[PDB]
Structures are given as C-alpha cells and as structure tokens.
C-alpha cells in the first residue's frame, strides 16, 4: 500500500 | 520512531509550532494523526495529514485552532496551533496509522509535547 | 459525535486474577462494510497510549496473549487473563468507524499486591 489508508473516522 | 519537539510556553493569544520528527518507515505510505491530551481522562483527536500530498482532514472543533503541514524533505510533521486559550494547556501526541493483518491502527506514538499557555 | 462510555472508572486487581473492562457506544460502530472499528489503548504513567487491540478482538503482535476483546456492535469488553504488575494505567477504548474519532473515559487499573 504506497498511499496512505486509514480507519473510515479519519476522513468524511 | 517518533521524535517531537520539547516544551512549550505560550502566553494567551500567541501561537505555537511543534514538530513530529519520523524515521524509519516509508514516511508517505502512512497518515500521522495528531491528539490532544487535556489531562487523564481527556483524549482528543485533532486531526490527520497525508504525507504524500499533504492532504489534512481535520476535527470540527479544532478548524481554526489546528493547521497541518508536512515537509517530505526532513520527512517532519508540524502542527501549528493558532490564538491560544486557557483550555488549550494540554500534552500534543503525534502517531502513525500503521498496518497489520490488513487493518489499520495507531502503532507509533510520539513521546508527547507539553504546552502550558499562560501570561 | 459518538460518546464513549467506560465502567468502571477506577480498577484494582491482584496479580495473577483476572480483570473485566467495559466500554459502551452511542450507535452501533458497526460500518457500511461489515467492520466494527474499536480499538483499545494502555497509558502506563509517564508514557505515551499505545493500542493494545483493533477490530474488537485482534491483539498487536507486541501484545501477550492474556489480553482478550469481546464485544458486540454497541457494548464492548477488554478482558485479561491474569493481570501483571507492568498491566497498570488508564486504558481507553476509541472508536473509528464514524468521523471524527472518539475517546472513552477512561479506566484507571491499580495493581493489587
């Protein structure tokens, strides 16, 4: 994964 | 893996800027959060920065406390905190959102900052 | 936002017994896909949190095995198995599936000798 990811509460 | 800057002491409507030095990881593969420590039983999120393009998602309450920017070339993360309050006396953690068994999680913390804001 | 609410405030275990944490959610965390992002955090005194379990229930590799999460889409519960000494400090639970992220209360664990 080279771009970044998160749990869904990070972003809208 | 994760260095922040030391000590601050701010008077009440001055703004301040601390660092989030990373190492050893792919500074652009993982978002860096951000979280605000009131006192033991405050844990806050202020908000998150993509290292890559720098995109920054930030809380509601903190939109016109909290800025974010990133510098790819020290692969450092700042947080610029604007028109500082007596509530904003607090610890400043920063984190990586990293990755495991196909989920995400905060993994690294930095050690803390600690801004007291009084004149 | 989501309001996290943690029981008991204040803890004390002796060693080698065993402990119950609760944490309880507004809504159900339970996302679009299928997911249910809780997380659980440890903050021994004079050291930064650091997550202890994702997703309920999966353990960091760092994390010894006497650590157990079980929860549902709105209640939750971090259970150890026989609590140590180096086990003390506030814990919180932290929910990621609905922005912007929360934290719980927090729940002081004294160690009993």
């Known amino acids: 994964g080279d771009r970044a990811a998160g749990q869904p509460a990070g972003d809208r | 893996q994760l260095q922040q800057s030391g000590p601050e002491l701010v008077k009440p409507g001055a703004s301040v800027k601390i660092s989030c030095k990373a190492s050893?990881?792919?500074?652009?593969?993982?978002?860096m959060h951000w979280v605000k420590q009131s006192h033991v039983k405050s844990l806050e999120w202020i908000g998150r920065?993509?290292?890559?393009?720098?995109?920054?998602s930030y809380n509601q309450n903190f939109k016109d406390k909290a800025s974010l920017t990133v510098d790819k070339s020290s692969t450092t993360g700042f947080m610029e905190l604007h028109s500082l309050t007596s509530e904003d006396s607090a610890v400043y953690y920063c984190?990586?959102?990293?990755?495991?068994?196909?989920?995400?999680?905060?993994?690294?913390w930095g050690a803390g900052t600690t801004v007291t804001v009084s004149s | 936002d989501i309001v996290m609410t943690q029981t008991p405030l204040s803890l004390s275990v002796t060693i080698g017994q065993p402990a119950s944490i609760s944490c309880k959610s507004s809504?159900?965390?339970?996302?679009?896909?299928?997911?249910?992002?809780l997380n659980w955090l440890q903050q021994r005194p004079g050291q930064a949190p650091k997550i202890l379990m994702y997703?309920?229930?999966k353990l960091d590799p760092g994390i010894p095995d006497r650590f157990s999460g079980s929860g549902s889409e709105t209640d939750f519960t971090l259970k150890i198995s026989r609590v140590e000494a180096e086990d003390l400090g506030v814990y919180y639970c932290?929910?990621?599936?609905?922005?912007?992220?929360?934290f719980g209360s927090g729940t002081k664990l004294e160690i009993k000798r």
């Open positions: 997703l309920v229930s």
């Open positions: 920065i993509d290292p890559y393009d720098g995109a920054t």
């Open positions: 050893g990881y792919s500074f652009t593969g993982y978002y």
């Open positions: 932290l929910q990621g599936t609905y922005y912007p992220f929360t």
């Open positions: 984190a990586r959102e990293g990755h495991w068994d196909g989920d995400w999680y905060f993994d690294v």
């Open positions: 809504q159900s965390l339970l996302h679009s896909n299928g997911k249910t992002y």
